Design a protein around this ligand. Structure first.
Ligand code: NA
Length: 248
């Protein structure tokens, strides 16, 4: 009655859950679909180290160096958009495609280099190679960036992924904060990627790529700048409610 999947209103047919098993540490084991793990079923899954609820929010807790033994890339505990059991895959200039979620970031991790902390709390992901060979990978990452292990206060919104990095550089925006509710709306329509925060358009930019097929949303906690980092207990914490995806 109280599970994270029930509180957030998600099902295996609408979102796949990327999570870990084992105590947090460099030897924890990543699962692209956590329900593949022994003993785990989607509508009862909860683990206070990673993915849990208090009946209002669902918390995604991920750690610097988590699983670093197996893979040095940035770790995540996150949802992957599904389409009635098929993988979601949709086109950024045909139809209008929206993810809305209410979020806070409560804690930033510590970069590999020790200076700074950052994580991504929503994304659009595209094809690794589109039909023209363009390496799209993440279309956009919506992130907060601040101090290493930051626990309160002021951060910047940072927009990364293809739409900024391959088109003039990542973009940052002042005046955001930890422990602060934002109603986020991420739209891909007409070949433009756009974020609204509390009803204001804060970022909007065209993808100058021909083939905008094979996108899907992700949302959760994808740490950043922790490639090759050791496990120290440093973590990020993202909490979400009021999640929906709309396709028109
Ligand atoms: Na299982």
């Amino acid at each position: 009655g109280n599970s994270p999947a029930s509180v957030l209103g998600i099902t295996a047919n609408t979102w796949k859950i990327n999570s870990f098993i084992g105590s947090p540490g460099s030897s924890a084991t990543y699962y692209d679909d956590i329900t593949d793990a022994s003993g785990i079923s989607y509508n009862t899954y909860s683990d206070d180290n990673y993915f849990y609820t208090d009946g209002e929010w669902v918390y995604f807790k991920c750690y610097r160096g988590l699983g670093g033994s197996a893979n040095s890339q940035n770790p995540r505990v996150e949802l992957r958009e599904m389409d009635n059991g098929n993988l979601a895959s949709w086109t950024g200039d045909s139809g209008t495609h929206t993810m809305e979620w209410t979020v806070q970031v409560n804690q930033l991790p510590q970069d590999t280099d020790g200076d700074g902390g950052v994580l991504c709390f929503g994304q659009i992901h595209g094809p690794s190679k589109n039909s023209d060979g363009v390496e799209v990978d993440d279309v956009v990452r919506v992130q907060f960036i601040g101090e290493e292990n930051q626990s309160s206060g002021s951060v910047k919104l940072k927009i990364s992924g293809y739409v900024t990095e391959e088109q003039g550089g990542s973009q940052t925006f002042s005046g955001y904060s930890l422990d602060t509710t934002y109603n986020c709306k991420l739209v891909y329509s007409g070949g433009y990627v756009e974020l609204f925060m509390n009803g204001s358009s804060v970022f909007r930019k065209k993808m100058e790529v021909d083939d905008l097929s094979e996108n899907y949303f992700k949302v959760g906690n994808y740490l950043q700048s922790v490639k090759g980092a050791s496990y120290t207990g440093s973590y990020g914490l993202v909490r979400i409610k009021n999640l929906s995806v709309t396709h028109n």
